[PDB]
Design a protein around this motif. Structure first.
Motif, PDB file in Angstrom:
ATOM      1  N   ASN A   2       0.973  -1.358   0.154  1.00  0.00           N
ATOM      2  CA  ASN A   2       0.205  -0.062   0.493  1.00  0.00           C
ATOM      3  C   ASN A   2       0.688   1.225   0.080  1.00  0.00           C
ATOM      4  O   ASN A   2       0.369   2.193  -1.373  1.00  0.00           O
ATOM      5  N   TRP A   3       1.659   1.206   1.084  1.00  0.00           N
ATOM      6  CA  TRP A   3       2.925   2.358   1.122  1.00  0.00           C
ATOM      7  C   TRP A   3       3.396   2.785  -0.251  1.00  0.00           C
ATOM      8  O   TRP A   3       3.768   3.941  -0.711  1.00  0.00           O
ATOM      9  N   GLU A   4       4.437   1.820  -1.022  1.00  0.00           N
ATOM     10  CA  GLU A   4       4.748   1.982  -2.287  1.00  0.00           C
ATOM     11  C   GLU A   4       4.300   2.322  -3.495  1.00  0.00           C
ATOM     12  O   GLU A   4       4.562   3.482  -4.020  1.00  0.00           O
ATOM     13  N   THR A   5       2.361   1.650  -3.172  1.00  0.00           N
ATOM     14  CA  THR A   5       1.359   2.133  -3.861  1.00  0.00           C
ATOM     15  C   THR A   5       1.273   3.685  -4.054  1.00  0.00           C
ATOM     16  O   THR A   5       1.409   4.766  -5.231  1.00  0.00           O
ATOM     17  N   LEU A   6       1.326   4.207  -2.904  1.00  0.00           N
ATOM     18  CA  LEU A   6       1.485   5.834  -2.661  1.00  0.00           C
ATOM     19  C   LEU A   6       2.133   6.516  -3.010  1.00  0.00           C
ATOM     20  O   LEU A   6       1.898   7.735  -3.752  1.00  0.00           O
ATOM     21  N   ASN A   7       3.149   5.963  -3.153  1.00  0.00           N
ATOM     22  CA  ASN A   7       4.553   7.252  -2.693  1.00  0.00           C
ATOM     23  C   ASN A   7       4.641   7.296  -4.427  1.00  0.00           C
ATOM     24  O   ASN A   7       5.474   7.633  -5.269  1.00  0.00           O
ATOM     25  N   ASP A   8       4.787   5.286  -5.493  1.00  0.00           N
ATOM     26  CA  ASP A   8       4.906   5.822  -6.302  1.00  0.00           C
ATOM     27  C   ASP A   8       3.813   6.323  -7.412  1.00  0.00           C
ATOM     28  O   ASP A   8       4.429   6.833  -8.426  1.00  0.00           O
ATOM     29  N   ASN A   9       2.401   5.852  -7.008  1.00  0.00           N
ATOM     30  CA  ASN A   9       1.529   7.038  -7.387  1.00  0.00           C
ATOM     31  C   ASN A   9       1.306   8.652  -7.668  1.00  0.00           C
ATOM     32  O   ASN A   9       1.870   9.877  -8.630  1.00  0.00           O
ATOM     33  N   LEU A  10       2.807   9.082  -5.811  1.00  0.00           N
ATOM     34  CA  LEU A  10       3.086  10.430  -6.051  1.00  0.00           C
ATOM     35  C   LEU A  10       3.624  11.099  -6.966  1.00  0.00           C
ATOM     36  O   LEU A  10       3.914  12.326  -7.638  1.00  0.00           O
ATOM     37  N   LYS A  11       5.039   9.964  -7.429  1.00  0.00           N
ATOM     38  CA  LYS A  11       6.308  10.268  -7.900  1.00  0.00           C
ATOM     39  C   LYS A  11       5.467  10.391  -9.774  1.00  0.00           C
ATOM     40  O   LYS A  11       5.863  11.240 -10.477  1.00  0.00           O
ATOM     41  N   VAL A  12       4.236   9.363  -9.922  1.00  0.00           N
ATOM     42  CA  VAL A  12       3.960   9.652 -11.509  1.00  0.00           C
ATOM     43  C   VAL A  12       2.907  10.953 -11.508  1.00  0.00           C
ATOM     44  O   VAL A  12       2.943  11.390 -12.479  1.00  0.00           O
ATOM     45  N   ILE A  13       2.314  11.291 -10.238  1.00  0.00           N
ATOM     46  CA  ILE A  13       1.571  12.788 -10.900  1.00  0.00           C
ATOM     47  C   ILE A  13       2.549  13.790 -11.040  1.00  0.00           C
ATOM     48  O   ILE A  13       2.483  14.805 -11.297  1.00  0.00           O
ATOM     49  N   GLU A  14       3.317  13.530 -10.035  1.00  0.00           N
ATOM     50  CA  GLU A  14       4.689  14.824  -9.785  1.00  0.00           C
ATOM     51  C   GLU A  14       4.691  14.932 -11.557  1.00  0.00           C
ATOM     52  O   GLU A  14       5.510  15.602 -11.791  1.00  0.00           O
ATOM     53  N   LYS A  15       5.100  13.709 -11.820  1.00  0.00           N
ATOM     54  CA  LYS A  15       6.329  13.777 -12.951  1.00  0.00           C
ATOM     55  C   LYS A  15       4.968  13.054 -14.554  1.00  0.00           C
ATOM     56  O   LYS A  15       5.878  12.841 -15.610  1.00  0.00           O
ATOM     57  N   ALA A  16       3.965  14.113 -14.673  1.00  0.00           N
ATOM     58  CA  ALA A  16       2.890  13.464 -15.609  1.00  0.00           C
ATOM     59  C   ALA A  16       3.145  14.692 -16.628  1.00  0.00           C
ATOM     60  O   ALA A  16       3.145  15.832 -16.496  1.00  0.00           O
ATOM     61  N   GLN A  24      -2.582  10.980 -16.396  1.00  0.00           N
ATOM     62  CA  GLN A  24      -2.129  10.560 -15.604  1.00  0.00           C
ATOM     63  C   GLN A  24      -2.289  10.525 -14.389  1.00  0.00           C
ATOM     64  O   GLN A  24      -1.909   9.849 -13.004  1.00  0.00           O
ATOM     65  N   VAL A  25      -2.209  12.015 -13.927  1.00  0.00           N
ATOM     66  CA  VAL A  25      -2.701  12.430 -12.716  1.00  0.00           C
ATOM     67  C   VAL A  25      -3.599  11.855 -12.147  1.00  0.00           C
ATOM     68  O   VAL A  25      -3.324  11.403 -10.736  1.00  0.00           O
ATOM     69  N   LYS A  26      -4.883  12.020 -12.748  1.00  0.00           N
ATOM     70  CA  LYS A  26      -5.834  11.009 -12.008  1.00  0.00           C
ATOM     71  C   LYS A  26      -6.126   9.481 -12.176  1.00  0.00           C
ATOM     72  O   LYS A  26      -6.301   9.360 -10.698  1.00  0.00           O
ATOM     73  N   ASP A  27      -5.681   9.253 -13.173  1.00  0.00           N
ATOM     74  CA  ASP A  27      -5.224   7.729 -12.433  1.00  0.00           C
ATOM     75  C   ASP A  27      -4.281   6.790 -11.663  1.00  0.00           C
ATOM     76  O   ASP A  27      -5.203   6.653 -11.233  1.00  0.00           O
ATOM     77  N   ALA A  28      -3.187   7.864 -11.346  1.00  0.00           N
ATOM     78  CA  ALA A  28      -2.695   8.001 -10.153  1.00  0.00           C
ATOM     79  C   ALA A  28      -3.349   8.138  -9.111  1.00  0.00           C
ATOM     80  O   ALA A  28      -3.219   7.799  -7.300  1.00  0.00           O
ATOM     81  N   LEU A  29      -4.759   9.223  -9.036  1.00  0.00           N
ATOM     82  CA  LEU A  29      -4.987  10.300  -7.906  1.00  0.00           C
ATOM     83  C   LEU A  29      -5.562   8.634  -6.804  1.00  0.00           C
ATOM     84  O   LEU A  29      -5.937   8.350  -6.060  1.00  0.00           O
ATOM     85  N   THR A  30      -6.561   8.051  -8.126  1.00  0.00           N
ATOM     86  CA  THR A  30      -7.916   8.117  -7.654  1.00  0.00           C
ATOM     87  C   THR A  30      -7.112   6.456  -6.984  1.00  0.00           C
ATOM     88  O   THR A  30      -7.515   5.611  -6.095  1.00  0.00           O
ATOM     89  N   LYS A  31      -6.018   5.654  -7.386  1.00  0.00           N
ATOM     90  CA  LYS A  31      -5.122   4.911  -7.097  1.00  0.00           C
ATOM     91  C   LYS A  31      -4.510   4.589  -5.869  1.00  0.00           C
ATOM     92  O   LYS A  31      -4.410   4.492  -4.645  1.00  0.00           O
ATOM     93  N   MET A  32      -3.879   6.542  -5.543  1.00  0.00           N
ATOM     94  CA  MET A  32      -3.337   7.116  -5.228  1.00  0.00           C
ATOM     95  C   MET A  32      -4.324   6.677  -3.406  1.00  0.00           C
ATOM     96  O   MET A  32      -3.714   5.795  -1.764  1.00  0.00           O
ATOM     97  N   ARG A  33      -5.455   7.101  -3.281  1.00  0.00           N
ATOM     98  CA  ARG A  33      -6.215   7.416  -2.571  1.00  0.00           C
ATOM     99  C   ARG A  33      -6.983   6.077  -2.303  1.00  0.00           C
ATOM    100  O   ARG A  33      -7.456   6.245  -0.802  1.00  0.00           O
ATOM    101  N   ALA A  34      -6.593   5.207  -3.058  1.00  0.00           N
ATOM    102  CA  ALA A  34      -7.721   4.017  -2.496  1.00  0.00           C
ATOM    103  C   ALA A  34      -6.419   3.911  -1.167  1.00  0.00           C
ATOM    104  O   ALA A  34      -7.109   2.333  -0.391  1.00  0.00           O
ATOM    105  N   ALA A  35      -5.537   3.453  -2.157  1.00  0.00           N
ATOM    106  CA  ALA A  35      -3.644   2.352  -1.042  1.00  0.00           C
ATOM    107  C   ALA A  35      -3.868   3.745   0.358  1.00  0.00           C
ATOM    108  O   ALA A  35      -3.666   3.179   1.124  1.00  0.00           O
TER     109      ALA A  35
END
Ligand SMILES: O=C(O[C@H]1CN2CCC1CC2)C(O)(c1ccccc1)c1ccccc1
Length: 380
Positions: free
Chosen positions: A203-217, A222-233
């Motif tokens: 869960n934590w790795e998923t959250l941080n990885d999706n945060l990095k995806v939002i930063e480099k989108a 990609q911003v929302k695709d990482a937002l929804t999964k980051m919030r789920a995790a």
């Protein structure tokens, strides 16, 4: 067309050699100048990059000279030194992959005993023992067998291992040197992937990885695709209990703070989603920077997949590039005409290509390796 074929072979061969040399040198120097890259894994990868560098410098060029000229022009001594160097380096590579596989195996099967014994000194002595053992196993038999039998059957213009005159000897040696190690590494990795196959780290790795995806989108997907999964995790990580100290009850201040941090995190995530819907995607990226701010503000409550992926990539590169030559060795035992000289050259060149592919398997997938690379290539 034949002249163009020779020119083409020389050009692509020099290109492959140069790429191999440059890449592996970049890896070695990157490990030597960045203390953050001075880990045991990168010690093993340092030895592997050294072997790949030796392959790119000596084996490739001399093999090109051999094939292009049509015979061995240098001499018997240089032929013996080239064969011994190539086979010692190959064996050292194989046992290096064995060291990586076993090291990961003991890391995943004995977490209470092996990680404390896993220092840079132990890795260094294991690597040194691998090289010394390879040199002892291969060098004397290649260099002095002619003196043992009292005759050199390698005629002028030829370059090959003398005691490999018999096909069954060559195949048996290929069983001891290639097939059994490949089986051992396959079983070891089987235990690795079954060991990795706990939830909090995912869960934590998923959250941080999706945060990095939002930063480099790059776009608005990609911003929302990482937002929804980051919030789920994020919510799934909030419902569960981290390794709290003293094993406190769910009504303790520590647990309430742990839930509160993810409450603020989900709130700011929803703010970034709002600003992302209004058309302010840039402000949603800055809001992701705010997510990093609060996350690190409440990161003391928390504390391997990419390592297993990297190991698998290296192993698969080695096996796929080295299997054709050894199956040519297997077929050569009962039908020598079934493998023409050109196909032998192809197998040799796949084996050498392994060294060119290796740096892209572990260096082009690591952020520290990339940053150190760009530091090495930028003009000071
Ligand atoms: O494929 C092999 O060696 C490759 C490395 N060098 C020398 C022969 C080929 C191609 C280039 C290898 O299985 C092999 C090759 C011929 C006979 C026996 C084994 C090998 C050799 C040394 C160490 C580990 C494996």
């Amino acid at each position: 067309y034949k002249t163009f074929e020779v020119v083409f072979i020389v050009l692509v061969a020099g290109s492959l050699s140069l790429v191999t040399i440059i890449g592996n040198i970049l890896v070695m120097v990157s490990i030597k100048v960045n203390r953050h890259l001075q880990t045991v894994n990168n010690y093993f990868l340092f030895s592997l990059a050294c072997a790949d560098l030796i392959i790119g410098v000596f084996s490739m060029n001399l093999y090109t000279l051999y094939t292009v000229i049509g015979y061995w022009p240098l001499g018997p001594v240089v032929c013996d030194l080239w064969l011994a160097l190539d086979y010692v380096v190959s064996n050292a590579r194989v046992m290096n992959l064995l060291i990586i596989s076993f090291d990961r195996y003991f890391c995943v099967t004995k977490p209470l005993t092996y990680p404390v014994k896993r220092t840079t000194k132990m890795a260094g002595m294991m690597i040194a023992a691998a090289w010394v053992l390879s040199f002892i196993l291969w060098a004397p038999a290649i260099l002095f067998w002619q003196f043992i039998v009292g005759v050199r059957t390698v005629e002028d213009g030829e370059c090959y291992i003398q005691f490999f005159s018999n096909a069954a000897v060559t195949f048996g040696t290929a069983i001891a040197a290639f097939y059994l190690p490949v089986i051992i590494m396959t079983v070891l990795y089987w235990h690795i992937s079954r060991a990795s196959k706990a939830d909090l780290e995912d869960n934590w790795e998923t959250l941080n990885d999706n945060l990095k995806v939002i930063e480099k989108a790059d776009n608005a997907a990609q911003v929302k695709d990482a937002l929804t999964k980051m919030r789920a995790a994020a919510l799934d990580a909030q419902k569960a209990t981290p390794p709290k100290l003293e094993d406190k009850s769910p009504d303790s201040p520590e647990m309430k703070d742990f839930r509160h941090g993810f409450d603020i995190l989900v709130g700011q995530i929803d703010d970034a989603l709002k600003l992302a819907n209004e058309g302010k995607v840039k402000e949603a990226q800055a809001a992701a920077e705010q997510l990093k701010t609060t996350r690190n503000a409440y990161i003391q409550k928390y504390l391997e997949k990419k390592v297993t992926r990297t190991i698998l990539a290296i192993l698969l590169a080695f096996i796929i590039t080295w299997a054709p030559y050894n199956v040519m060795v297997l077929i050569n035992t009962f039908c020598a005409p079934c493998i023409p000289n050109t196909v032998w050259t192809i197998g040799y060149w796949l084996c050498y290509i392994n060294s060119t592919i290796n740096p892209a398997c572990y260096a082009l997938c690591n952020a520290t390796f990339k940053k150190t690379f760009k530091h090495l290539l930028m003009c000071h």
